Design a binder for this molecule. Sequence first.
Ligand SMILES: [Mg+2]
Ligand SMILES: [Mg+2]
Ligand SMILES: [Mg+2]
Ligand SMILES: [Mg+2]
Ligand SMILES: [Mg+2]
Ligand SMILES: [Mg+2]
Ligand SMILES: [Mg+2]
Ligand SMILES: [Mg+2]
Ligand SMILES: [Mg+2]
Lengths: 149, 222, 131, 65, 126, 195
Amino acid sequence: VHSYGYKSGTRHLFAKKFRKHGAPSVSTILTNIKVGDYVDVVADSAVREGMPHKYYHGRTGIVWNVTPRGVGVIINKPVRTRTLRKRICVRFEHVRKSRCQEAFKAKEHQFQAYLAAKKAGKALPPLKKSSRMGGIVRPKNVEVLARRV
Amino acid sequence: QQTENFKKAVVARKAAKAALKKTAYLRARKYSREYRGAEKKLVTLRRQAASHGNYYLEAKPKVAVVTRIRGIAKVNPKQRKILQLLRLRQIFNTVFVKMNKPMENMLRAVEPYIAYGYPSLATVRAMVYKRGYLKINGQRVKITDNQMIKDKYNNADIVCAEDMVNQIYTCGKHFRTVTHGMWPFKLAPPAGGMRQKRRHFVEGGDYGNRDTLINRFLARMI
Amino acid sequence: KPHLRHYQVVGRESPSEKNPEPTVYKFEVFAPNFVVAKSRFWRMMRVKNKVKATHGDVLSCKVVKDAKLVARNYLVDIAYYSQRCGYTRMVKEFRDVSKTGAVSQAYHDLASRHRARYHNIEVLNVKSIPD
Amino acid sequence: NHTNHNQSSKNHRNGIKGPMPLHLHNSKRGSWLPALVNARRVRKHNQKAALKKRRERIAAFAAKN
Amino acid sequence: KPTVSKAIVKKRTKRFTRHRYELFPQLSSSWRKPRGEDSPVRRRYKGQKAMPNKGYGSDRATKYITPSGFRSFPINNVEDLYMLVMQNRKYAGVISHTVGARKRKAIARKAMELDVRLANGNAKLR
Amino acid sequence: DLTGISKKSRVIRHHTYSTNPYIKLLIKLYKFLAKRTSSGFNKVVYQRLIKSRSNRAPISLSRIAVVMKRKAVFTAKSKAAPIAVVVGDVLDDVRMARIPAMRVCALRFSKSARQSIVAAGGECLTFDQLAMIAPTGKNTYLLRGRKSGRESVRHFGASGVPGSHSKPYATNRGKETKRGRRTGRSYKRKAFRHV
RNA sequence: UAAGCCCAAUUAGUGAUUGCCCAUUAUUCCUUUGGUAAGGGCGGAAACUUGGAGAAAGUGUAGCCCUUCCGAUGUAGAUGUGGCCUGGAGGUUAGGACGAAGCUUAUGGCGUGAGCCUAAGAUGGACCGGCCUCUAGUGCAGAUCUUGGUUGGCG
RNA sequence: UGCAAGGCCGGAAAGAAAUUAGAGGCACCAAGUGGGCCUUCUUCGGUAAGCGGAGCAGGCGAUGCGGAAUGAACCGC
Ligand SMILES: [Mg+2]
Ligand SMILES: [Mg+2]
Ligand SMILES: [Mg+2]
Ligand SMILES: [Mg+2]
Ligand SMILES: [Mg+2]
Ligand SMILES: [Mg+2]
Ligand SMILES: [Mg+2]
Ligand SMILES: [Mg+2]
Ligand SMILES: [Mg+2]
C-alpha cells in the first residue's frame, strides 16, 4: 500500500490514444449541456486541470450542475452494499453528451410518428418486414466437406 | 328464503359449467385442426421442395422446454441468478420458455445445469395435464378442471386446458401469461436413468440442447 | 444392432443480410443421434467454411435408408487425433454389411488400439470394394 | 491478511441497493449560485401563485356551489 | 362410557434419551440437546440416536389420546366428576394418587353411577 | 430447492401486545368488520389498533380542526360533516381558541380535549359508537397525528456524520459543543452533504 | 479363451421405450410444524352411519372448526412459546393417618421435548397438589471445580 | 417581441428491453464475528513444497446423507 495517490495506476488510462494527441476538440468546447442530460465522463489528458479520479472514467450520469466552465455530474458508485450518487465536478472537456438514449430518442421519434400514422396519422406506409420463418429455399451451389490436409 | 337464491345460482354452478365445456370443446377442435392443418401444410411445402429441386428450411422451434438436471449444489452466482429467473429452483423443474435472442442466451450460460430442447405437442400437454399446477392466489393448485383455468388467467382467450397447450405449443400471444401463471413443473427423475449429468448431450453425457430428443427425455419424467 | 447410424445433414448460413443466398453445404456423418450429427455438422462449417451454428441454420438432416442387407467390402478413410501421433489418417479396409456397420467397427478399432474416440475422429470416403 | 474473499457475496446478501432516483435529495445546493438565486426567486412567485390559485378556487367554489 | 373413534398410529416409541446416558450413572433419561461443537449426535451421524424434531409430533386428531380412547383429565373429588360427565365420551377421569382411600371409594361409586370412565379402579367392580 | 427468498419475510405484527381489555373488544369488533366487509376503512383501522402505543401518535385538536377545515372547504357546503377518526388519542390544543362543531372518534381524549370538543358544539364518539354510525366508515376522515419531531426520532442518526442534524445523547447540553462541533477545532461536522 | 484396458451396449440384426442395484436427492402419499400463507365456516342438521359446512369471533393451547398451499439442516448469535422445571408470596381450587412430602422402578401413558400424570412399594409417617399473578440464592456432567462418601488397582 | 433557459403547467401519449414479475422503500435496537482454511480458474515470490502473498467464484468452518475401500474440502446431493 506504498502509493495510493489521486493519480495512481493510471498510465494507460489517462494516456492519449495513438496519433490523436494535443488540444481538445472545438466540438467539445462548443457542446451544450443542461441540468439533466447524460454525459460520458471520459477524462482526457492534455488538459490536466479538472480531470476526475480514475474511477469516474467509463462512467456516465446526470448533469446536476452546469457552472460556467465546470459540469457537475452525478455518478452511481457501488461502494460496498449500496450505491452512492457521487457528485463530481469536472470541466467541460472531460465530458461528452452521452448517446445512451438515442436508442429510444430516435426510436419513439419515428416509432410514434408511425404509431400515430398507424393509429390516426394520415396514412400507414408499410414498414420493416418479418425476419425469422420457414421457406422452400432454392440452392445455387452444392458442396460437401471432408478435410483439407 | 335463502334456499332459493342458492338453488337458482346453483344453476349457475351447473349452467356456467356446461356453457364452459362447450366453449372448451369448440376451441379444442379448432386447435386440433390448427395442428392437423398446419402440419399437413408443412408436409406439402416440403413435398414441392424436395421434388422440384428446392430445400424447405424447417422454419424454427418457437418454444423450448428447459429442465434443470443438476441440483442446488455449488453454483456460480450468475449461473444461479439465471436459474432463479427461469424458475429452475430445484432439480427437474421443466419450464416452457421462448427462444428469443435475449432468452436463449440465458440458456447458453447455464447449460451444465439445464437440459432443454423443443417440446413435441404430445409432450406439452403431457406436462400440462399430468403435472400442470397453477398459481391460484399464491398456491400450487392442480389443474383439476377447466374452471380453475379461466378464474386464474381471466384473459379473455385462455379458457380450457388444451388452450393453455396451444398458447405454450406455439410461441403464442399469451405465453408470458400461461407460463408465468403456472408453477415450474416439479417432475420425477426419468425412469431408465440418465446417461450422465456432467457432460453435454453430444459428448455422450446429457445436458444442453437436444433438439426434439427431449421428448424421449420428458416422457420418462412425466 | 450396430449403433452410429448414418445421417445426411445439410445447411445454409442464415441468408444473410450480406450475401442473401449463401452456398448450401451437405455432408454425411455417422453419429449416434442427429443432435450429434448437427453438432458435427457445425464443426465442419465452423472449420471448413468458417460458419457458426449461430449464424446459420440446418436445412434438412436426414437418416440414409439402408443397403440391401448383404455382406461386402469397405475401405473407410478415417482420420483421428491423439497425443498418440497427432492427426494421422488411416484406411483400415473392413468387411461388414452396411456402411453404418463397417464404420462402427472402424470406431471400435481405433478406440481399441489408439484410444481415439468419437469426437477425435473424422471420416471420409466410406466406399466399397469389389475384390 | 487482506483477502477480499466472501466480500462480494456479503455485498449481495442484503443486496447492493440501487441508487436513489433523482427526485430524492435533488438539493440544487452548493451548485452555481446565479442559477439557484434565480431558481429561488421564481419559486417565490410560483408560490404566491400557488396560494393565489387556491384563493379563487374556494371563493369560486363557494358562490358557484 | 365408550370412546370416540380415532386413528391412533404413533410415530416414535423409543424415548429420546440424552447421549452417553448409560456410560454414567449420573446423567438422566431426559433429553438434553448436545451443545457439543463436534458431538456426533448434534451433527447427526448415521448410527447415532436421534434428536427431538417437530417432525415427530403426533397426529393432532389423536394427540393426547390414552390407549383406551378417552383423553385424560385429573379428578380429585366426586364433584369434579360432574364437571366431566358431559364429556364422558371424550374425556376420562384420573384420581390423583393423593386422594385417600375413604374418598376414592366415594368417587369410584359415583363414576359407574355416572358412566364417567375412570382410568383407575376395578376393585371387584369396574 | 435453492430460494434466496429468506429475508423477504416482513414483520406485520399479527396481534396486539396490549393488555387493555377495552381495546381487545375494539379489535374483535374490527376483525369482524375488517374481515367480513368490503370496507377499505375497516381494513386500515384494524391494523392501526393492533399497532403499538408509540406508533399511535396523538393528533392535537389543532391538527384535527385544520384538516377538517381543508375538507369542509370543498364539499356540498350542506352535505355532512365527516367524522375525524384517529386511532391514537386526541389532545387539547391551547393554541386553537375556537374549535368547530366536529365529530371525533378516538380511542381516548384528554380531559381538556373532551371538554373542548363538547364545549365547541361537537360530540366525541367512541369506536363501539362509530360501528353504529358508518361501520364501513363512509364519510370518515381517518387521521394519524405527527410522529416526527418526536424527541426519539431526532436522536436517530449519528450526529457526528456530515449532514446529520440529530441530537446526541447527552444529559449535559453544554458538554458536547466543543471540538468536532466547531469550525475552529480542527474540523466541524459538515452541516450539509448530498445523499 | 477376464472379474484388465479402450470403445460400445441393454434383451440380441425381430419391429422405435425404463438392462439392473443403492440416497436425508426427485416424484407421490400420509404426519408434524412454521408462514400470519391463503381460503371457508366462525350454532343446529341428516347421510346408513354418525361427523359435521352446529362446537367459542380466537396470536399463542389439549389450535374455534375444517382444507389449501409452501418451506423445514445448521456452529457464534438472535428471538418466540397458553412452555418446562425448583424455592417462596398474593389469590383460587383442592387433597391428607382410609397415609402428605419424600423415596424406589422391567409402573405404565403422553407430550417432538423439557416434563407431567398414574400404580405399587414386605416404602415413608405429616404435610401438600392443580390454576392465575408475584418472586428469586430457580435447572449442572465436565471448571487440575468445592465438600462428603465410595471404588479400582488389591488382599 | 420571440428563440433558448430555468421553476412550472394544462391540453393531450403510446408503447403490436426478454425473464422472474417469488413486493419497493427506508428506520430502529442488538448481538456474534474481526486467527480462517481448502479449492477452481491465473499468478506474484520461492530450489521446492502438504510453501508464502494475491484476484475470482465455490466451498469447509457451521454439514449431514449417498460413494471415491480410507479422508473436514473431492463426485453427487
Ligand atoms: Mg450414473
Ligand atoms: Mg413417546
Ligand atoms: Mg417538534
Ligand atoms: Mg430461596
Ligand atoms: Mg445459583
Ligand atoms: Mg452433580
Ligand atoms: Mg469429574
Ligand atoms: Mg458436502
Ligand atoms: Mg481409493
